[PDB]
């Protein structure tokens, strides 16, 4: 038994997203989000909207002042000034210097990124990258690589920042923010592999993999409620195969509890495993 | 700050906690496990698993990527996986090959698949990469150490992939293991700086920065950080920490590799953080 | 105005950026901006550039 | 209580179909199904078709329910794990995507785009009911 390890009667390790646990000679859970360079409340209050980038900047500045950090207000103010839509590059060099080559554009962003990388937090890094994400052939290619405000050589690093803040966000439990943030990734998504669904044709009764039949040139799935063609979400019944447009069966199963198609097939407890 | 009711008749060994923060985990010397309700701060027992024939050490959980899975490893040589099915906790599938007492168990990043890793005193590196339809494709690497493996730690997913993990045993040595394109878990490097029996190894979670970090605690006092700043060089440059008065067995990282908390034989937990000058500084 | 007229950023954090702006604007032959910015900012930035370059700008 | 031969009358079927069309045009959504239910109860030729049939893509094996067919685009949990309607899984005719019914409902209430990654096809805001 000498070769065996020796008994351990203590321990203390990280868990969750802001807590610890120490089994040192019961166990105590103490919230320690005060020492992490990341703050959950900012994660709740933030907002990203590709429709209007300026609005996200001012609202984020307001939230930053609300949570009490006099650094993010400066950073977001510089951001909202920097991403003004009147500073857009032109697709011809021979007119004017791009804003990237200005010593207040790319270089300021690089300095701030280095500073927060030293601080070792992913929140502001991912947010800033998400916001800023927006012979003759050689000259055009070099100008194209030179217009943008984010260095093309660190796209993998920026994606890594984003997909790490995403795991943080999922850990916290506010996921819709994660689904918003994980769009700006330059990396294409992985597609799904396995089985897939097929809606038999409503006219020729053939299994067609799509919203439109390849033989009858019509709609293969018809709503079990409105009796029309559907293009949205289905969430149909797997036992009997009947289904419709999402609002319609949601309304049906609000109070009614039998298959509208008539096969009976009360799948409200069958499909829902 | 809330204190969970132990309700056990043995000394606990480790207390892991699920991904979202909902339920606590437990170990003891009576070969029993118990998962409680940390939600709202009211400790409610959800099970009292009559486990193996001997004391258990580690219960590290898995990602909900593949669902509610638990892991366990005991002095009575056995590896057991639990899943909370239909409102109850019950046995799901097991691993049998264990010549000696098992020392550690850790899970894998939620991009390699659903892979377990374990190490026993027999010195055999037996990954338990769970196959489909409930079976486990138990790969093995025997004679991984002169005396036996103690603990393993995996590496963050960095761009198939190039999987890795790190381990160290009672030979006062630390090893690292990569995979060939075919699937051979042979060797990548052999880092050795301590003379005492190294116990635990951990990888700092990768923010995106091209600098790794391996904080490991040996038997006597060796708490050397194992930074590997250069990707091509594959050279680890120690930066030793303070020397503990007693033996140190555990190590754990924060979620952004900022704070390091170590567990030692003095029944105390001290929280550390690297300073501006690169030195590691303790905290309150 | 944001940088000067302002859990805080370090004080002398933007000095290199301002100096590089002054050099960038002066280099391409536009001194109406470098001189004006120099005059307005005063001691906040004047103690960062050498005297010879300043005299060149002004003259 | 007509007999099978009587229920096979062309006039009867045409009249029933005309009534069905009229009942459809009246927008009485929850009532047309009632006539359908009575038709299926009284007669077993009025049974509805299977319609949706999940069999496509690559099939595959060693990984099956009873690789995978769903994935939760908004929780990345395989569908079928143990408000009952809120636990189902929706699919997109156009967006070629899907996810948890409650998760999709909440995200589409808040967000207004294909949560399917790097996608643009509105999986629900396409019929505009
Ligand atoms: Zn057709
Ligand atoms: Zn059904
Ligand atoms: Zn049906
Ligand atoms: Zn419909
Ligand atoms: Zn199959
Ligand atoms: Zn769609
Ligand atoms: Zn889902
Ligand atoms: Zn989509």
From Swiss-Prot, chain A:
WD repeats lie at residues 48-86. It comes from the Eukaryota. Zn(2+) 2 binds at residues 226, 245, 248. This is GATOR2 complex protein WDR59. Zn(2+) 1 binds at residues 201, 204, 213, 216. Component of the GATOR2 subcomplex, composed of MIOS, SEC13, SEH1L, WDR24 and WDR59. The GATOR2 complex interacts with CASTOR1 and CASTOR2; the interaction is negatively regulated by arginine. The GATOR2 complex interacts with SESN1, SESN2 and SESN3; the interaction is negatively regulated by amino acids. Interacts with DDB1-CUL4A/B E3 ligase complexes. A zinc finger (RING-type) spans 220-272. The gene is WDR59. Residues 135-150 have a biased composition (Basic and acidic residues). As a component of the GATOR2 complex, functions as an activator of the amino acid-sensing branch of the mTORC1 signaling pathway. The GATOR2 complex indirectly activates mTORC1 through the inhibition of the GATOR1 subcomplex. GATOR2 probably acts as an E3 ubiquitin-protein ligase toward GATOR1. In the presence of abundant amino acids, the GATOR2 complex mediates ubiquitination of the NPRL2 core component of the GATOR1 complex, leading to GATOR1 inactivation. In the absence of amino acids, GATOR2 is inhibited, activating the GATOR1 complex. Residues 135-151 are annotated as: Disordered. Zn(2+) 3 binds at residues 237, 265, 267. A zinc finger (C4-type) spans 200-219. Zn(2+) 4 binds at residues 242, 259, 263. Belongs to the WD repeat WDR59 family. It is found in: Lysosome membrane. It comes from Homo sapiens.
UniProtKB/Swiss-Prot annotation, chain B:
The keyword Oxidoreductase does not apply. Keywords: Acetylation, Cytoplasmic vesicle, Endoplasmic reticulum, ER-Golgi transport, Lysosome, Membrane, mRNA transport, Nuclear pore complex, Nucleus, Phosphoprotein, Protein transport, Repeat, Translocation, Transport, WD repeat. SMART domains: WD40. WD repeats lie at residues 7-46, 51-92, 97-140, 144-187, 193-236, 243-282. It is a peripheral membrane protein. Its main location: membrane. It comes from the Eukaryota. Functions as a component of the nuclear pore complex (NPC) and the COPII coat. At the endoplasmic reticulum, SEC13 is involved in the biogenesis of COPII-coated vesicles. Required for the exit of adipsin (CFD/ADN), an adipocyte-secreted protein from the endoplasmic reticulum. Belongs to the WD repeat SEC13 family. It holds the Pfam family WD40. This is Protein SEC13 homolog. The modification Phosphoserine is found at residue 167. The gene is SEC13. InterPro entries: Sec13/Seh1_fam, WD40/YVTN_repeat-like_dom_sf, WD40_repeat_dom_sf, WD40_rpt. GO terms for molecular function: identical protein binding; structural molecule activity. The GATOR2 complex is negatively regulated by the upstream amino acid sensors CASTOR1 and SESN2, which sequester the GATOR2 complex in absence of amino acids. In the presence of abundant amino acids, GATOR2 is released from CASTOR1 and SESN2 and activated.
UniProtKB/Swiss-Prot annotation, chain C:
The chain holds residues 453 to 678 of 790 of the full protein. This is GATOR2 complex protein WDR24. Component of the GATOR2 subcomplex, composed of MIOS, SEC13, SEH1L, WDR24 and WDR59. The GATOR2 complex interacts with CASTOR1 and CASTOR2; the interaction is negatively regulated by arginine. The GATOR2 complex interacts with SESN1, SESN2 and SESN3; the interaction is negatively regulated by amino acids. SESN1, SESN2 and SESN3 convey leucine availability via direct interaction with SEH1L and WDR24. It comes from the Eukaryota. It is found in: Lysosome membrane. Autoubiquitinated; MIOS is required to prevent autoubiquitination. Catalytic component of the GATOR2 complex, a multiprotein complex that acts as an activator of the amino acid-sensing branch of the mTORC1 signaling pathway. The GATOR2 complex indirectly activates mTORC1 through the inhibition of the GATOR1 subcomplex. GATOR2 probably acts as an E3 ubiquitin-protein ligase toward GATOR1. In the presence of abundant amino acids, the GATOR2 complex mediates ubiquitination of the NPRL2 core component of the GATOR1 complex, leading to GATOR1 inactivation. In the absence of amino acids, GATOR2 is inhibited, activating the GATOR1 complex. Belongs to the WD repeat WDR24 family.
Swiss-Prot record, chain D:
Zn(2+) 1 binds at residues 56, 59. Zn(2+) 4 binds at residues 95, 97, 114, 119. Zn(2+) 3 binds at residues 92, 95, 123. Zn(2+) 2 binds at residues 75, 100, 103. It is found in: Lysosome membrane. A zinc finger (RING-type) spans 69-128. Disulfide bonds: none annotated. Belongs to the WD repeat mio family. Component of the GATOR2 subcomplex, composed of MIOS, SEC13, SEH1L, WDR24 and WDR59. The GATOR2 complex interacts with CASTOR1 and CASTOR2; the interaction is negatively regulated by arginine. CASTOR1 and CASTOR2 convey leucine availability via direct interaction with MIOS. The GATOR2 complex interacts with SESN1, SESN2 and SESN3; the interaction is negatively regulated by amino acids. As a component of the GATOR2 complex, functions as an activator of the amino acid-sensing branch of the mTORC1 signaling pathway. The GATOR2 complex indirectly activates mTORC1 through the inhibition of the GATOR1 subcomplex. GATOR2 probably acts as an E3 ubiquitin-protein ligase toward GATOR1. In the presence of abundant amino acids, the GATOR2 complex mediates ubiquitination of the NPRL2 core component of the GATOR1 complex, leading to GATOR1 inactivation. In the absence of amino acids, GATOR2 is inhibited, activating the GATOR1 complex. This is GATOR2 complex protein MIOS. It comes from Homo sapiens (Human).
């Amino acid at each position: 038994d000498a070769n065996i390890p020796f008994p351990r009667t203590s321990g203390a390790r990280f868990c969750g997203a802001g807590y610890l646990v120490y089994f040192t000679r019961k166990v105590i859970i103490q919230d320690i989000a005060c020492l992490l360079p990341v703050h959950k409340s900012l994660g709740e209050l933030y907002i990203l909207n590709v429709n209007d980038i300026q609005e996200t900047c001012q609202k984020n500045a307001a939230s930053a002042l609300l949570v009490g950090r006099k650094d993010l207000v400066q950073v977001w103010s510089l951001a909202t000034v920097a991403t003004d839509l009147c500073l857009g590059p032109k697709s011809d060099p021979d007119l004017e210097t791009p804003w990237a080559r200005h010593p207040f554009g790319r270089q300021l962003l690089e300095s701030l990124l280095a500073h927060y990388c030293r601080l070792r937090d992913v929140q502001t890094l991912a947010m800033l990258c998400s916001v800023f994400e927006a012979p003759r052939e050689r000259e055009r290619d070099q100008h194209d690589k030179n217009k943008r405000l984010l260095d093309p050589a660190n796209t993998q690093q920026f994606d890594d920042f984003k997909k790490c803040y995403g795991e943080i966000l999922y850990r916290w439990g506010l996921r819709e923010k994660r689904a918003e943030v994980l769009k700006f990734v330059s990396c294409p998504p992985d597609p799904h592999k396995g089985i897939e669904f097929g809606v038999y044709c409503s006219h020729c009764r053939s299994e067609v993999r799509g919203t439109q039949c390849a033989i009858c040139k019509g709609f293969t799935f018809q709503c079990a409620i409105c009796h029309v063609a559907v293009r949205g979400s289905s969430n149909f019944c797997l036992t009997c195969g009947h289904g419709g447009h999402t609002s319609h069966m949601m309304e049906w199963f609000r109070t009614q509890e039998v298959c509208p198609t008539g096969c009976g097939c009360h799948c409200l407890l069958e499909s829902t495993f | 700050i809330n204190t969970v009711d132990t309700s056990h008749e043995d000394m606990i060994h480790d207390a892991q906690m699920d991904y979202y923060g909902t339920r606590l985990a437990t170990c003891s010397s009576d070969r029993s496990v118990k998962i409680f309700d940390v939600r709202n701060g009211g400790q409610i027992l959800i099970a009292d698993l009559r486990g193996h024939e001997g004391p258990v050490w580690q219960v590290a959980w898995a990602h909900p990527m593949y669902g509610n899975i638990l892991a366990s490893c005991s002095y009575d040589r056995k590896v057991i996986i639990w899943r909370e099915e239909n409102g109850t906790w019950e046995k799901s599938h097991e691993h049998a090959g264990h010549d000696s007492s098992v020392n550690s168990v850790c899970w894998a990043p939620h991009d390699y698949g659903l892979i377990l890793a374990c190490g026993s005193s027999d010195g055999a590196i037996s990954l338990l990469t769970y196959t489909g339809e409930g079976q486990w494709e138990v790969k093995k690497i025997n004679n991984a150490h002169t005396i036996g493996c103690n603990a393993v730690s995996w590496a963050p997913a960095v761009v198939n992939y190039i999987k890795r993990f790190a381990s160290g045993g009672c030979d006062n040595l630390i090893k690292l293991w990569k995979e060939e394109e075919d699937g051979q878990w042979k060797e990548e490097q052999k880092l050795e700086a301590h003379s005492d029996w190294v116990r635990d190894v951990a990888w700092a979670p990768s923010i995106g920065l091209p600098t790794s970090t391996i904080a490991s605690c040996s038997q006597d006092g060796r708490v050397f950080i194992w930074t590997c700043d250069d990707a091509s060089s594959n050279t680890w440059s120690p930066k030793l920490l303070h020397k503990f008065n007693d033996v140190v067995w555990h190590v754990s990282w924060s979620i952004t590799a900022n704070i390091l908390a170590v567990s030692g034989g003095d029944n105390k937990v001290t929280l550390w953080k690297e300073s501006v000058d690169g030195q590691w500084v303790c905290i309150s | 105005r944001i940088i000067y007229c302002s859990s805080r950023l370090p004080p002398d954090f933007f000095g290199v950026l301002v100096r590089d702006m002054l050099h960038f604007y002066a280099e391409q032959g536009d001194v109406q901006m470098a001189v004006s910015v120099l005059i307005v900012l005063g001691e906040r930035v004047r103690k960062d550039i050498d005297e010879q370059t300043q005299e060149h700008w002004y003259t | 209580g007509s007999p099978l031969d009587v229920l096979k009358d062309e006039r009867v079927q045409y009249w029933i179909e005309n009534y069905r069309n009229l009942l459809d045009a009246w927008r009485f959504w929850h009532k047309r199904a009632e006539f359908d239910i009575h038709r299926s109860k009284l007669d077993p030729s009025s049974k509805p078709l299977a319609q949706v049939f999940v069999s496509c893509n690559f099939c595959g094996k060693s990984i099956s329910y009873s690789k995978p067919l769903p994935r939760c685009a908004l929780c990345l949990i395989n569908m079928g794990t143990p408000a009952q309607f809120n636990n189902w899984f929706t699919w997109c005719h156009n967006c070629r995507h899907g996810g948890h019914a409650g998760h999709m409902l909440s995200w589409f209430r808040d967000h207004a785009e294909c949560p399917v990654s790097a996608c643009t096809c509105k999986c629900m805001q396409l019929d505009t009911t």
